[PDB]
Design a protein around this nucleic acid. Sequence first.
RNA 1: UGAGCCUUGAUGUGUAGGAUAGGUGGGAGGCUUUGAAGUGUGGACGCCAGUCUGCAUGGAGCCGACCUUGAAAUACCACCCUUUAAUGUUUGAUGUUCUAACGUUGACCCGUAAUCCGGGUUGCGGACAGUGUCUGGUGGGUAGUUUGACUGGGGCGGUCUCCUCCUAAAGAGUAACGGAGGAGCACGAAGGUUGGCUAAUCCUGGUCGGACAUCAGGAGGUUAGUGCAAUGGCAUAAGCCAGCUUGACUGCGAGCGUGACGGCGCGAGCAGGUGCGAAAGCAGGUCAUAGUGAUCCGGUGGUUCUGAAUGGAAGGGCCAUC
RNA 2: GCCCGGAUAGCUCAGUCGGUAGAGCAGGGGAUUGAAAAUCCCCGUGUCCUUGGUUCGAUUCCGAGUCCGGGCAC
RNA 3: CGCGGGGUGGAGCAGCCUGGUAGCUCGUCGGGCUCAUAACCCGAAGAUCGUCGGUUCAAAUCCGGCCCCCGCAACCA
Lengths: 54, 128, 234
Amino acid sequence: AKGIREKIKLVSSAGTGHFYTTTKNKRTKPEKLELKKFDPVVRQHVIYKEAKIK
Amino acid sequence: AKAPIRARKRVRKQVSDGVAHIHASFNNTIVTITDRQGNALGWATAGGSGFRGSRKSTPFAAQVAAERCADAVKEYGIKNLEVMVKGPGPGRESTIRALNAAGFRITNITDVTPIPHNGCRPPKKRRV
Amino acid sequence: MAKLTKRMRVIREKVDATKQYDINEAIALLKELATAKFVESVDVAVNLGIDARKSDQNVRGATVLPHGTGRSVRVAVFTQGANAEAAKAAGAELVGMEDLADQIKKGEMNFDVVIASPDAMRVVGQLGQVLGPRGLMPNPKVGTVTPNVAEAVKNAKAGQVRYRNDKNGIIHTTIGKVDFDADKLKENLEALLVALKKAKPTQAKGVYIKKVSISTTMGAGVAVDQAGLSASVN
RNA sequence: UGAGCCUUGAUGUGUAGGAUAGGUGGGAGGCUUUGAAGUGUGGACGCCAGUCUGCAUGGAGCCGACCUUGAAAUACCACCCUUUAAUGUUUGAUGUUCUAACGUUGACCCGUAAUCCGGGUUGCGGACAGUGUCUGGUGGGUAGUUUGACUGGGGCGGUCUCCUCCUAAAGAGUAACGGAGGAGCACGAAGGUUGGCUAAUCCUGGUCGGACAUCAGGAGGUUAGUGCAAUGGCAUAAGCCAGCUUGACUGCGAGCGUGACGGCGCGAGCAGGUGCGAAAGCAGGUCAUAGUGAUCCGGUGGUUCUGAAUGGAAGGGCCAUC
RNA sequence: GCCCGGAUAGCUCAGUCGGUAGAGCAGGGGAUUGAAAAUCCCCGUGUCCUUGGUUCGAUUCCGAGUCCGGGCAC
RNA sequence: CGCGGGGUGGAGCAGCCUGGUAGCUCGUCGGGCUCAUAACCCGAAGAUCGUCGGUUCAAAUCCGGCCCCCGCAACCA
């Protein structure tokens, strides 16, 4: 579909099953995101991790 | 420590005596060893022995083909030879001389060269 | 395997060496099959069938036999005197620094583990894992090395043995002496078979028997048909 | 004759080392009609004299065991990688030979006064052609169809969605193949927040860019900036820089502009938790309007919500999202 | 979006079972001929892709991801 | 009408895809060999990218207008 910049999933680092979805320029810097954000299931702000990978 | 002696992996077939054929011509000489009952046992040539150019049709190049070939048949344990000589090239007798000096005993130097009884028309090359 | 010598061909046929048999009767046979004139020791090779790739990865540790191994797991205490007296008393081979530090550097050694408090390892370290027919070093790869000398020695005398993922995917461990009852060996073997299952392999689901084989010092070995909870599960 | 599975037998010549270093546990030695060893004869034999060893002979020790060298040490029993012969074993591949299925639009007989057809003998071919089911290719021979609208006639050409200006008539912004330009994304800072600061251009002086770097002074007063188009905008900056940061939040949401509907826009405030700031306060993306895709279908993760007799499960639902 | 399979002299490949950086042709110099076409010669270059890991040491031996080339997916 | 391609040192061709980069074979000029020319060898010179504008820090290149060269199209009753 869109651009050459592409979709990643930012997965919560609590063991609960929750994610935010976001697009990121893999080519220019592929240095994977940290970033802290809300997780509604633990109902607190937690670090999110990764980028649609194992 | 170990630094090697044996020249190849252990001998195969093993026939004791063979026939050689030297096809000597104006562009290149081919030396091919066979069994009495008709089997190639190995070959080498002047061109394959790394000469090329004008050197490919020289008695010196013919010799070095013969010694190279002599290595290839060592795996067959051969000691005695008969030789067939074939064509009008240089290297024709000089190849034989290299075979006797290889330590082989040569039984006959039978020149075989194939001659038409008038037969088919030659090309007419170098023309005017 | 067992040599071409004229009586040694005769021995190997008459005793029925290598090939499979059932755990109670293989062990009772193993005492009868013995090639040594004296007490042979019994070891198990256990095949885990996933990561033979990596020496670290499949399960490693130590496990409790109800019968503490006699000659094998011949345990010594490494220290010049750090809370020594009970660990030296218990039946251990030797308590010191100087004799075991020279021996292990010179090369060959026959014994199991010499158990160290942190300060003892500091003065004289260990080297390597290419230990061949000779196995002689504690390491975090064995993993039983934490941390006190009287505890690990006395627990060995009660039941402890060590267990390790060797590069074939094979786990080799001493199970006992042919001095032991067929029963005593079988209890020690069964404790090991639960130990590989108990810690669980990373990519495999249990004891995960491709092959288990139990061998005695000169007698030979017997490959084992079962996971050792009695003879047959179902 | 390939391969697998599998029965027994085997090599691994590095650097140092006497030589022997396939990975690794046990292990202080193994003694039927010995276990000798050892010189000798041949075979295999290869990172060359280095291993195993048929066996003449000999019934008179290999050799570790802290015997030594070396990260690992050797004897000796397990373990199993490589290569691998011997052989076992199932199956495939191949040929040749057979004949008994099977073909015979070969012959001869008989039904027969048909000599089609059947039955008989006999020759030739032969597990091949053949034919059924499965299946890859090919296949306009055959068949069922498809092949846009707009359009100053229609074909050719252009164009179809979304943004900005004009036409547009001083609220709604409203046509024409009317006039003029762009978008199909970017961004982890180019977002948040605190704090600070202010532009194009020209002149004058200026160590070589004296047409234009960097510098200083002055005039000017934004003539600039604005991720990218134009219009609106902005100095309290919506511009430019620095510090800490992840409100580019989850649940909602009065009230509303807007559209035939689908849908799209807007948002005080409330609840949870948080960032920045002394605090007030600020923050639910980017100064705004372009940066798009209904539904079916199928995918991945979560969720006792359900799950065709009970219990579980494929499956279905909800939520996240492709 | 998987399974595959490659990523080095400039190139293709490859001595590379981990103890150890090459063949064929490419550019310069020398050596000879109506310079040349053409002999023969001596140099041609790589932390084997970026990261993990076995180990006495290993790029390759065991592994995760980027790019190229080949299938089935939709 | 209309649409698309082209305009390079004296000749024929390349580079033209948000861009900074001028290359090849001929021909030319200087030196050389040859009695002399041809050829042959060595060295050098030669394009302010048709033209005008615009966007851009920068344009042969991208964008717009005009002239010039080519290909196709300019029907249907």
